[PDB]
PDB file of C-alpha atoms and ligand atoms in Angstrom:
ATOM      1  CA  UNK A  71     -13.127 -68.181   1.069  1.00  7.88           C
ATOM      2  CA  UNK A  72     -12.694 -71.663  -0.222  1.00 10.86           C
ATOM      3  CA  UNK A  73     -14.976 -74.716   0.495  1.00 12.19           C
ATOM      4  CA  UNK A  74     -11.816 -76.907   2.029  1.00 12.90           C
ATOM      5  CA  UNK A  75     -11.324 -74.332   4.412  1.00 14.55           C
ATOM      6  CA  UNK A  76     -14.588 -75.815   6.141  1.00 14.97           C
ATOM      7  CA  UNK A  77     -15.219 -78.769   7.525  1.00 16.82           C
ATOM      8  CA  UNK A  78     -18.580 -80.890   7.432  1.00 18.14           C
ATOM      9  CA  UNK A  79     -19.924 -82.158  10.745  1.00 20.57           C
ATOM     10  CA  UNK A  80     -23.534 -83.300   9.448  1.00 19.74           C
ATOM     11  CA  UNK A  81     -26.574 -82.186   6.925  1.00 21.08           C
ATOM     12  CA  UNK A  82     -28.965 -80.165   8.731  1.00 19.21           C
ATOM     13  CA  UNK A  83     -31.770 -79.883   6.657  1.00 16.86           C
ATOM     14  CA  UNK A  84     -32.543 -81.026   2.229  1.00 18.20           C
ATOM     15  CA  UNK A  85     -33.293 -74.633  -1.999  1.00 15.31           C
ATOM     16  CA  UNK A  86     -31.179 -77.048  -1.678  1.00 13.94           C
ATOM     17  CA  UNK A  87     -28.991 -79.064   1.339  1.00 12.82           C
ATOM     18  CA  UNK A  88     -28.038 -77.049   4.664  1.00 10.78           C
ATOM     19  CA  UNK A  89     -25.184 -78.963   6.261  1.00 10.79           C
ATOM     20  CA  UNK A  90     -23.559 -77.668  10.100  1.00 12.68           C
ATOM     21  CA  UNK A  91     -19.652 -77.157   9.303  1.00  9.80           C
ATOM     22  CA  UNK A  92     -16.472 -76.208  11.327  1.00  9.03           C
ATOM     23  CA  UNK A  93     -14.099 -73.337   9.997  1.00  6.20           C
ATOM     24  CA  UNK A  94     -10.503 -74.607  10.182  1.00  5.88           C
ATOM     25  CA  UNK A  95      -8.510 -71.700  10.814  1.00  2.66           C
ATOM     26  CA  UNK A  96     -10.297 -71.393  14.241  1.00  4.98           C
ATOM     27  CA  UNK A  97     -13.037 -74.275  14.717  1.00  4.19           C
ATOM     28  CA  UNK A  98     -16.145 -71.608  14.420  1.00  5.55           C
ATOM     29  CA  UNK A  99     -19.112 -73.637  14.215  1.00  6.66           C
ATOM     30  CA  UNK A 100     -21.500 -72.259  11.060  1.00  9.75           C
ATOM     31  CA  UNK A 101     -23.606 -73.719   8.491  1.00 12.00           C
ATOM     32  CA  UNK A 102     -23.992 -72.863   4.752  1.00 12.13           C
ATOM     33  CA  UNK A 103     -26.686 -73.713   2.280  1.00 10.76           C
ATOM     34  CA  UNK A 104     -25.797 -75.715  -0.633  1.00 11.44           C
ATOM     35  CA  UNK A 105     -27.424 -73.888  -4.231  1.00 14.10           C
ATOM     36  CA  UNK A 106     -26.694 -75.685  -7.481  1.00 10.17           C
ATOM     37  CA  UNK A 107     -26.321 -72.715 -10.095  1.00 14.16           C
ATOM     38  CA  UNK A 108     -25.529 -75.489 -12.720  1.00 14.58           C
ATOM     39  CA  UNK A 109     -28.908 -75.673 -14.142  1.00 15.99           C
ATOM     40  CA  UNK A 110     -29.087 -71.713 -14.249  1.00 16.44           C
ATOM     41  CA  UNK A 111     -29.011 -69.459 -17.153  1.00 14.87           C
ATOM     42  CA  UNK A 112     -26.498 -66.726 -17.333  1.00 14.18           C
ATOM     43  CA  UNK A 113     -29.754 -64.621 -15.890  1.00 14.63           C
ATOM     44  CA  UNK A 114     -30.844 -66.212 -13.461  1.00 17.51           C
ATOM     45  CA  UNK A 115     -27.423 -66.459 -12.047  1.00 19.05           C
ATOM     46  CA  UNK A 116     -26.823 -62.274 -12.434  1.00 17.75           C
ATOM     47  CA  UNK A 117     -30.092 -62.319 -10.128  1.00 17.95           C
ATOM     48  CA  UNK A 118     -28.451 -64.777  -7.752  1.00 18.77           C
ATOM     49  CA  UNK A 119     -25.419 -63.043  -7.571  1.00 16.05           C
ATOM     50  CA  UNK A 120     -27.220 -59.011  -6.701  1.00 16.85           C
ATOM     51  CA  UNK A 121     -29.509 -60.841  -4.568  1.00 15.81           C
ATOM     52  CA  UNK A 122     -26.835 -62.060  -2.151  1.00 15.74           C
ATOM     53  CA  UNK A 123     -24.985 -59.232  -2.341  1.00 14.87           C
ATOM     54  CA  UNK A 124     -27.887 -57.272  -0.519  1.00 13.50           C
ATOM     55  CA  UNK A 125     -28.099 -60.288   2.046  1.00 15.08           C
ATOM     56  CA  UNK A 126     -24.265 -59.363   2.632  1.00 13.33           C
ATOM     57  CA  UNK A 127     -25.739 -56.414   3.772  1.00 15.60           C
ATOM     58  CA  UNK A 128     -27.864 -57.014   6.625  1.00 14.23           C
ATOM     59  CA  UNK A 129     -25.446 -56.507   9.961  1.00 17.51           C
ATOM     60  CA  UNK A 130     -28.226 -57.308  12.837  1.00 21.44           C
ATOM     61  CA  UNK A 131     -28.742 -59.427  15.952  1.00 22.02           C
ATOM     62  CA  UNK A 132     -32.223 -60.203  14.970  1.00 23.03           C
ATOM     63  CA  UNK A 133     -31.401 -61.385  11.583  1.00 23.73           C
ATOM     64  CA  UNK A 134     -29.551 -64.535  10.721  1.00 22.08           C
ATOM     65  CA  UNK A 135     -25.743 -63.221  10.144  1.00 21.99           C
ATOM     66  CA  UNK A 136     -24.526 -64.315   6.452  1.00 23.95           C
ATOM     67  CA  UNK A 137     -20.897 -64.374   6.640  1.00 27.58           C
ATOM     68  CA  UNK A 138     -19.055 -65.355   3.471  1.00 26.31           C
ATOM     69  CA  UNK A 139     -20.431 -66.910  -0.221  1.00 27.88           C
ATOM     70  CA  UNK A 140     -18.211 -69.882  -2.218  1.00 30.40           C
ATOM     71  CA  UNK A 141     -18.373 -70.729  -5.001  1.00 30.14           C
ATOM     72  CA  UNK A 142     -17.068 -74.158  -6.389  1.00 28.58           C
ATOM     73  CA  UNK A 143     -17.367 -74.286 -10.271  1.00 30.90           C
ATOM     74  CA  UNK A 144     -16.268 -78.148 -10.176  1.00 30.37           C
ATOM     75  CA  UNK A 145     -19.903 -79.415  -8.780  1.00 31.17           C
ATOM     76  CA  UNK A 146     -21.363 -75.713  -9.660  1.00 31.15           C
ATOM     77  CA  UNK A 147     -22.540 -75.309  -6.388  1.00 29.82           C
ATOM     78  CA  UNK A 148     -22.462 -72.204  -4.246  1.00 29.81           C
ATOM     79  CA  UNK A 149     -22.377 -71.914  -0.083  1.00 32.53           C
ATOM     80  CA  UNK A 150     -24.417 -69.242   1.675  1.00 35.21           C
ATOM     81  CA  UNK A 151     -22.451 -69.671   4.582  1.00 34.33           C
ATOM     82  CA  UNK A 152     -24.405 -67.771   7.648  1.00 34.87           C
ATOM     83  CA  UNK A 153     -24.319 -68.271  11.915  1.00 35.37           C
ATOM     84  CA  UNK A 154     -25.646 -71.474  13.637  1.00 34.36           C
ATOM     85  CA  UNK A 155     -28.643 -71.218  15.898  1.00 36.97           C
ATOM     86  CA  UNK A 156     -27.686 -74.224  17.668  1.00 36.08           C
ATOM     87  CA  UNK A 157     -31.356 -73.830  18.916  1.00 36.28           C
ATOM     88  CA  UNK A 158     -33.334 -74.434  15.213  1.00 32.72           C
ATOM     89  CA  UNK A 159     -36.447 -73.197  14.291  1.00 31.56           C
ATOM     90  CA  UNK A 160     -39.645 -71.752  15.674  1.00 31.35           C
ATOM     91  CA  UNK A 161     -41.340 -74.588  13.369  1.00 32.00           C
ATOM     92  CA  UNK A 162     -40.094 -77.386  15.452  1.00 33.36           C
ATOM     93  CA  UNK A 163     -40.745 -75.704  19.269  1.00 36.99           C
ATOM     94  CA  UNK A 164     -44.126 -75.241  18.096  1.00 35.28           C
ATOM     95  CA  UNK A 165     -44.543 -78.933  17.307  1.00 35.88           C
ATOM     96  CA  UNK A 166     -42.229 -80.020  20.666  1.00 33.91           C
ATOM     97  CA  UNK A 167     -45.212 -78.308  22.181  1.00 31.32           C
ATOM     98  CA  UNK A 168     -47.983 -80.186  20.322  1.00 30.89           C
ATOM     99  CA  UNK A 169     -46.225 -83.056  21.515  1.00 34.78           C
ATOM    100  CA  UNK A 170     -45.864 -82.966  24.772  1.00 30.24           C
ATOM    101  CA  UNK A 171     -48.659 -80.834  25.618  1.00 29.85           C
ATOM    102  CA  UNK A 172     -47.029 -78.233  27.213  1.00 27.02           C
ATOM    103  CA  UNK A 173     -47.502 -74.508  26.154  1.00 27.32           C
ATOM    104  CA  UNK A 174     -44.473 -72.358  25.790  1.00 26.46           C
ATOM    105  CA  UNK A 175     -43.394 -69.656  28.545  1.00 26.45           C
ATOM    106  CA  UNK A 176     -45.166 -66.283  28.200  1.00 27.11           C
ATOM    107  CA  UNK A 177     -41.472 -64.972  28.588  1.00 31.00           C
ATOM    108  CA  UNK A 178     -40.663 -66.768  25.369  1.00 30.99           C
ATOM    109  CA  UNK A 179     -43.945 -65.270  23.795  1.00 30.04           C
ATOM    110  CA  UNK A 180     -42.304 -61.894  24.525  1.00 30.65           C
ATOM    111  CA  UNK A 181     -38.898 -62.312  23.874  1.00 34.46           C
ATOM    112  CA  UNK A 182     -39.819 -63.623  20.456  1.00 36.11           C
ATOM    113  CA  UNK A 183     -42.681 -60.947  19.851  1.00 37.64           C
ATOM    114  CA  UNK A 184     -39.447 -58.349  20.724  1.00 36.84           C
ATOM    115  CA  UNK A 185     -37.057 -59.551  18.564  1.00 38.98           C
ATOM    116  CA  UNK A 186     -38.765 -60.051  15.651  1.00 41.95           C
ATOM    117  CA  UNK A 187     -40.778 -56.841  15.473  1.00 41.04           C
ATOM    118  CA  UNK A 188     -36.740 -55.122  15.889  1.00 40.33           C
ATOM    119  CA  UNK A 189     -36.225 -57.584  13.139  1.00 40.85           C
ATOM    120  CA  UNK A 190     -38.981 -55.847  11.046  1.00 46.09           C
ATOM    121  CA  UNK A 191     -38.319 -52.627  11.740  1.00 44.69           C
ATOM    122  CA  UNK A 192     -34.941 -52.879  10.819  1.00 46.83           C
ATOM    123  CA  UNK A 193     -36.421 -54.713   7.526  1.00 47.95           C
ATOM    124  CA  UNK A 194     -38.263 -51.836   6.360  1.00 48.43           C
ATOM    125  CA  UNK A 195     -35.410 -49.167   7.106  1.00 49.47           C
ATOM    126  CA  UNK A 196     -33.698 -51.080   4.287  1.00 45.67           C
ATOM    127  CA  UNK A 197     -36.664 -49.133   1.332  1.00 43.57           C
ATOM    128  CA  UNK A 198     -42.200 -64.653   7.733  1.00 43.19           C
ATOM    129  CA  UNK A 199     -43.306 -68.116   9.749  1.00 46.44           C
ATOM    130  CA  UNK A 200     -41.988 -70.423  12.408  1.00 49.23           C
ATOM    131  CA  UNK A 201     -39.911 -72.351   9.637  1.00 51.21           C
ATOM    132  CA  UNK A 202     -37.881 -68.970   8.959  1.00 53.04           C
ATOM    133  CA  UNK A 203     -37.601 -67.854  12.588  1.00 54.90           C
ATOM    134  CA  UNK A 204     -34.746 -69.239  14.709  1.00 54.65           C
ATOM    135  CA  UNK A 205     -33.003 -69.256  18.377  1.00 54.86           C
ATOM    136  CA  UNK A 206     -29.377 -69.225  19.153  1.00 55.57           C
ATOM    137  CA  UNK A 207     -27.719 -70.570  21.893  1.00 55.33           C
ATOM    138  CA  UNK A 208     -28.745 -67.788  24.234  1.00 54.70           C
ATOM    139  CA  UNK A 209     -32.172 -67.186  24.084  1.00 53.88           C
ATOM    140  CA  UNK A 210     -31.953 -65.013  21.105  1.00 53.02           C
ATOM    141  CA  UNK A 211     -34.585 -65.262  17.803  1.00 51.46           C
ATOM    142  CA  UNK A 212     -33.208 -64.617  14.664  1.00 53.49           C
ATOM    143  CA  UNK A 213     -34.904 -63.899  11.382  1.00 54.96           C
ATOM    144  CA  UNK A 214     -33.731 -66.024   8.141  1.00 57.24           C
ATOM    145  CA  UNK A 215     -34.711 -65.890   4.679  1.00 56.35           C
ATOM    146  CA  UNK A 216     -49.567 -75.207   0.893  1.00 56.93           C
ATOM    147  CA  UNK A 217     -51.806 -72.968   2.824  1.00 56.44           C
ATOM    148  CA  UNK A 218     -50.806 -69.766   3.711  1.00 56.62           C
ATOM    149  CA  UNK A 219     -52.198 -69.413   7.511  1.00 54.87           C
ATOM    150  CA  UNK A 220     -50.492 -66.566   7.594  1.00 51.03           C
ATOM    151  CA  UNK A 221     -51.635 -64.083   4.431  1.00 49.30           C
ATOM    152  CA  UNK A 222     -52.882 -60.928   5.803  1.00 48.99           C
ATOM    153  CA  UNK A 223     -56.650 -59.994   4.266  1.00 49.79           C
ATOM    154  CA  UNK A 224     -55.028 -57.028   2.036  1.00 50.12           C
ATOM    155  CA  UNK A 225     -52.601 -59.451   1.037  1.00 45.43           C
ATOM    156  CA  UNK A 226     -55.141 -61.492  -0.859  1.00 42.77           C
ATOM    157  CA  UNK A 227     -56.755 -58.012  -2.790  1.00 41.93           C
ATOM    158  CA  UNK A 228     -54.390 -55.592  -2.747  1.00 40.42           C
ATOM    159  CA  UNK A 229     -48.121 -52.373   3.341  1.00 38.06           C
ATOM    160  CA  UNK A 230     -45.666 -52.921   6.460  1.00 37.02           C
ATOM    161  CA  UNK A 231     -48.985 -53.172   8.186  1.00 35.96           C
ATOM    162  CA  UNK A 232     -49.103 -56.573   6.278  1.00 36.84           C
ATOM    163  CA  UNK A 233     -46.079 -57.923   8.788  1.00 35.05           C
ATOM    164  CA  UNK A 234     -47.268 -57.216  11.593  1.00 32.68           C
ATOM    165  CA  UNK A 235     -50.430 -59.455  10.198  1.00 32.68           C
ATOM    166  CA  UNK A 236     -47.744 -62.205   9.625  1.00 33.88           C
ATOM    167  CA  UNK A 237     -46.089 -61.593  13.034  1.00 32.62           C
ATOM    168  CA  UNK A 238     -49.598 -61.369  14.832  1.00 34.21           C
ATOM    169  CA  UNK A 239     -50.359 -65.308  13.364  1.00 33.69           C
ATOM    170  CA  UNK A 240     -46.567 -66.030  14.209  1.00 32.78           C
ATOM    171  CA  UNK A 241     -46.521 -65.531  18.369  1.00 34.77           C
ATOM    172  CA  UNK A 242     -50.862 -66.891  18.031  1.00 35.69           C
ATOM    173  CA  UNK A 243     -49.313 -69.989  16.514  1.00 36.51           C
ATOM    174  CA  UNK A 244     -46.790 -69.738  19.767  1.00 35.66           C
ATOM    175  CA  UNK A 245     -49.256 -69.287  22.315  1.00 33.70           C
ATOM    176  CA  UNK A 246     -52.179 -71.648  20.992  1.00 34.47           C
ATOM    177  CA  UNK A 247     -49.514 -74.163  19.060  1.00 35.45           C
ATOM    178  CA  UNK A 248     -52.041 -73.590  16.022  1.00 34.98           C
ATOM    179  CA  UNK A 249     -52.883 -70.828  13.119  1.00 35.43           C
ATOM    180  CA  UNK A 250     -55.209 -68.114  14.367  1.00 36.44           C
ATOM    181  CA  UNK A 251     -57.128 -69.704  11.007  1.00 32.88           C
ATOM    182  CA  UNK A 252     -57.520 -72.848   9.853  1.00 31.75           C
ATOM    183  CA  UNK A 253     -59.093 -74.480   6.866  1.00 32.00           C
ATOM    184  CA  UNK A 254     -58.604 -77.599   4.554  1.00 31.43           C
ATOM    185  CA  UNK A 255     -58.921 -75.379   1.434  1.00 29.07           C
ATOM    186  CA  UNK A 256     -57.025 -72.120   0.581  1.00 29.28           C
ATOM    187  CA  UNK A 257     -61.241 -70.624   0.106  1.00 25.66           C
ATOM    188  CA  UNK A 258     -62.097 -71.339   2.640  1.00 26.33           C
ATOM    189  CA  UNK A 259     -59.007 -70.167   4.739  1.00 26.56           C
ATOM    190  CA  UNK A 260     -59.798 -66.779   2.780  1.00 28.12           C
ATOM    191  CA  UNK A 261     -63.259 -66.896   4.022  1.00 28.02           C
ATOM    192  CA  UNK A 262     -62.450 -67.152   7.635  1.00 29.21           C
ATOM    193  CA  UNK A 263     -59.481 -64.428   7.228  1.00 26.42           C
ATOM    194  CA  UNK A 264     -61.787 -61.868   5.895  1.00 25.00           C
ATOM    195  CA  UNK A 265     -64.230 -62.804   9.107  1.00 25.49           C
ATOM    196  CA  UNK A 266     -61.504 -61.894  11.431  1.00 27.68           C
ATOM    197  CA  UNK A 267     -62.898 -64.292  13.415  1.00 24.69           C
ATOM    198  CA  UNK A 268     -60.560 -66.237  16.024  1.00 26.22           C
ATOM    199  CA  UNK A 269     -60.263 -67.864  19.654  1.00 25.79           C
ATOM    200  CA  UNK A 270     -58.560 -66.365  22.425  1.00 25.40           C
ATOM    201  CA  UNK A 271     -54.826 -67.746  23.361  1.00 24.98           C
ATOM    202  CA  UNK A 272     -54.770 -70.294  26.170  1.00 26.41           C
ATOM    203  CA  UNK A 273     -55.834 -68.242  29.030  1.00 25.55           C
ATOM    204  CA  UNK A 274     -52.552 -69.006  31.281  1.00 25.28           C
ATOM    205  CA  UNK A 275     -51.503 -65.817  28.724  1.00 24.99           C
ATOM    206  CA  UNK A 276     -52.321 -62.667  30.212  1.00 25.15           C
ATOM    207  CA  UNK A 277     -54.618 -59.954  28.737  1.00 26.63           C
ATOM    208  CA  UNK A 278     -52.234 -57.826  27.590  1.00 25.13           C
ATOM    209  CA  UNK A 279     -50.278 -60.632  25.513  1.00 22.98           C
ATOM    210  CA  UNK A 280     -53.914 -61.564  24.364  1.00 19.61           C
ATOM    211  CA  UNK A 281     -54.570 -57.710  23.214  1.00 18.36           C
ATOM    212  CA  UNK A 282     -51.233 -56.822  21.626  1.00 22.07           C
ATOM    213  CA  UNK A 283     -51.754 -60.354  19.183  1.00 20.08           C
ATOM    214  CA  UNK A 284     -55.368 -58.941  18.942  1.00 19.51           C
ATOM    215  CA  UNK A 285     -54.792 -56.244  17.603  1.00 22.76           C
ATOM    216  CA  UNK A 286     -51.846 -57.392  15.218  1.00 21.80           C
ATOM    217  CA  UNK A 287     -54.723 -59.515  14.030  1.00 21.55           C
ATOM    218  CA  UNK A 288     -56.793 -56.594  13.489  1.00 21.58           C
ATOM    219  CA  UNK A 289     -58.746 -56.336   9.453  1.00 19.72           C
ATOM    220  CA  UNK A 290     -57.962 -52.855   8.966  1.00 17.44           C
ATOM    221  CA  UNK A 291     -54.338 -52.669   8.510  1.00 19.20           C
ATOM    222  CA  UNK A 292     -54.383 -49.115   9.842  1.00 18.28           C
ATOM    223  CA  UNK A 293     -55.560 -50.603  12.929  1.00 16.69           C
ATOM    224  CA  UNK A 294     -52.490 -52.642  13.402  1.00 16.51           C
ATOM    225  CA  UNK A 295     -49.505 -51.433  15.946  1.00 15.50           C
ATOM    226  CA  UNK A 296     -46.798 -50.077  14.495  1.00 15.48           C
ATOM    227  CA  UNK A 297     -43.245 -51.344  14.904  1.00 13.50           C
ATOM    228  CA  UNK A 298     -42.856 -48.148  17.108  1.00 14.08           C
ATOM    229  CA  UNK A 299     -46.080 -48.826  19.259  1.00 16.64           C
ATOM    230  CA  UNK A 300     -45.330 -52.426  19.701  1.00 18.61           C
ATOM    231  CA  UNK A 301     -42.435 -51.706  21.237  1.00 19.40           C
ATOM    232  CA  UNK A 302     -43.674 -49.223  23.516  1.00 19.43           C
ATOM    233  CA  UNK A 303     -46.208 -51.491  25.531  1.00 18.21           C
ATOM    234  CA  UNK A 304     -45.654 -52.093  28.638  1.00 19.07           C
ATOM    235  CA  UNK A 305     -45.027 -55.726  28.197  1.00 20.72           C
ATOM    236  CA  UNK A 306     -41.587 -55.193  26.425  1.00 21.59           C
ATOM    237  CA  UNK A 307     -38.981 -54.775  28.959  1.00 21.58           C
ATOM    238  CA  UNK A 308     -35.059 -54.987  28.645  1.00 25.00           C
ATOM    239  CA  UNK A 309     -34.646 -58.676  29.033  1.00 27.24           C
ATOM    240  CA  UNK A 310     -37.091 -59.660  26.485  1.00 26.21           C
ATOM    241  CA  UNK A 311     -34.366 -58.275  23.662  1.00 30.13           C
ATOM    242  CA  UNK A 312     -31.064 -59.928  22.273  1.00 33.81           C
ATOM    243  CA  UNK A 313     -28.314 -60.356  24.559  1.00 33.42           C
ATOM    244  CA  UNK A 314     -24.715 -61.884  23.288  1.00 33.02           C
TER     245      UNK A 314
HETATM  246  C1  LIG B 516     -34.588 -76.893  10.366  1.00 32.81           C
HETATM  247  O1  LIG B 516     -34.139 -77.427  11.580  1.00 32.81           O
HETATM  248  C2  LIG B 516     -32.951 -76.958  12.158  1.00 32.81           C
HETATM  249  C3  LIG B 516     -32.323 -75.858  11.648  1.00 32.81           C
HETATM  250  C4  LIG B 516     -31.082 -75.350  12.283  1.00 32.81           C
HETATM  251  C5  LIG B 516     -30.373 -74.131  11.699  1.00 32.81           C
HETATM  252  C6  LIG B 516     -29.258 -73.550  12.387  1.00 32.81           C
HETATM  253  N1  LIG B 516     -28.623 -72.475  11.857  1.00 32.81           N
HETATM  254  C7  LIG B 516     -29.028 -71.973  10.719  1.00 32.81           C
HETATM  255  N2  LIG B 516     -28.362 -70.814  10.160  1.00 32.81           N
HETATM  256  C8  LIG B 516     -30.178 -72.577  10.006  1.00 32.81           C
HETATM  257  C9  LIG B 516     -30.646 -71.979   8.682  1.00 32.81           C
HETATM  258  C10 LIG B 516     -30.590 -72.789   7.440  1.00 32.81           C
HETATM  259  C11 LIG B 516     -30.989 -72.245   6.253  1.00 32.81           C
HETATM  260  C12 LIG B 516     -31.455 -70.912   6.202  1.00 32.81           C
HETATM  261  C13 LIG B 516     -31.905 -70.318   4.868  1.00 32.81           C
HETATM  262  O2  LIG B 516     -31.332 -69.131   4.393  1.00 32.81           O
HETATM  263  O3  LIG B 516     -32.623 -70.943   4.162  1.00 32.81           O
HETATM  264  C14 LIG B 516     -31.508 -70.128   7.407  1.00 32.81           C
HETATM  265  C15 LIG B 516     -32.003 -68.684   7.366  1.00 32.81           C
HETATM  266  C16 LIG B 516     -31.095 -70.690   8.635  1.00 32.81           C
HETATM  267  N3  LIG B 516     -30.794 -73.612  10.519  1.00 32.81           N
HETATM  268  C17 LIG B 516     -30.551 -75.993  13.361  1.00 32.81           C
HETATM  269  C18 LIG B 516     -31.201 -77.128  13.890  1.00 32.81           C
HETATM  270  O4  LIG B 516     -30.664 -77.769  15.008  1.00 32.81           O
HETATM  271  C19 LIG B 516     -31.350 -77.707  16.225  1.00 32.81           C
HETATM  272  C20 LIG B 516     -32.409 -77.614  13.285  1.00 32.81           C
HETATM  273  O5  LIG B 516     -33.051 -78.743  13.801  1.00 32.81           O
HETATM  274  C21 LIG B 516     -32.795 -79.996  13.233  1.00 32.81           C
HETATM  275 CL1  LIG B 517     -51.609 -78.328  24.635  1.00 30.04          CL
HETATM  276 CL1  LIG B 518     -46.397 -68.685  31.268  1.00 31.26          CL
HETATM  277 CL1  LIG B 519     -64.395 -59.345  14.377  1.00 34.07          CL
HETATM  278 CL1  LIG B 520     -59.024 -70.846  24.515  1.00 34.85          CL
END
């Protein structure tokens, strides 16, 4: 559980730095995420320390394994260290599709609508956006710990319900490769959001994809599928979950 028993390939991402890394003992590629403490009071730290402690909890193929935390009191830095998903974030598939003007595969919709709703619902048995959303090497999506496109109309006034909000603007942002609602100004984006106002997906998306988003985009949060009802439409099927 010591930093040399790593090895740095290259920096991912600049929390703090995110750098890929090979275990020595057996060559498993990971990555951890670099967090300076050394600026931290003996609080904040106490927070740090509970709050990771809970993320060493979480044992789920839909959420972003954690595997092991090091501390190294020399640069006061501490390593989240956690799976690769050699296949990165939702963030940057939605822009490769900007790009190259291609929409992604209703299949991918799906799968990604599947996981992340198991991802949820195993979320709230323990009592969200493209950049925190990410794919392995086989297909699977992972969860992983400014306007905000995504802020439910409750959330802005006063709820699960509220995630499946999030996740409804998540797989629109997938299927359109843009924000159910859009704005230059965070009143504006409020004003639209309480409208509930927004244009069909691309219509090479079937009607059920287009209803299930619908109604995850619904006002009334009690309108909103549940975890349990997302799962149940007929859309979901075997294939569209995590497979090792
Ligand atoms: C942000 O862009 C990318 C991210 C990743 C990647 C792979 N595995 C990971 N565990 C993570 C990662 C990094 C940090 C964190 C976090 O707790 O803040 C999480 C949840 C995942 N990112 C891989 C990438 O390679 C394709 C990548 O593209 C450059
Ligand atoms: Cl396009
Ligand atoms: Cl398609
Ligand atoms: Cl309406
Ligand atoms: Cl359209």
């Amino acid at each position: 559980s010591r930093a040399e028993d790593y090895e740095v390939l290259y920096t991912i991402g600049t929390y703090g730095r995110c750098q890929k890394i090979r275990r020595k003992s057996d060559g498993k590629i990971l990555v951890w995420k670099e967090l300076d403490y050394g600026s931290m009071t003996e609080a904040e730290k106490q927070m740090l320390v509970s709050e990771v402690n809970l993320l060493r909890e979480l044992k789920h193929p839909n959420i972003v394994r954690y595997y092991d935390r090091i501390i190294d009191r020399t640069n006061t830095t501490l390593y989240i260290v956690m799976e690769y998903c050699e296949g990165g974030d939702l963030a940057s598939v939605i822009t490769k599709g900007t790009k190259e003007r291609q929409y992604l595969d209703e299949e991918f919709v799906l799968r990604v609508m599947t996981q992340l709703t198991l991802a949820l619902k195993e979320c709230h048995r323990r009592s969200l956006k493209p950049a925190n959303v990410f794919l392995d090497g086989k297909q699977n999506v992972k969860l992983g710990d400014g306007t905000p496109y995504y802020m439910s109309p409750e959330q802005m006034n006063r709820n699960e319900k509220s995630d499946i909000w999030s996740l409804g603007c998540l797989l629109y942002e997938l299927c359109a490769l843009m924000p159910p609602f859009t704005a230059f100004s965070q009143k504006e984006l409020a004003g639209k959001i309480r409208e509930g106002k927004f244009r069909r997906i691309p219509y090479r998306y079937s009607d059920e994809l287009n209803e299930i988003i619908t109604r995850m985009l619904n006002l009334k949060d009690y309108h909103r599928p549940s975890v349990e009802e997302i799962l149940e439409n007929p859309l979901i099927l075997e294939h569209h979950h995590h497979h090792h």
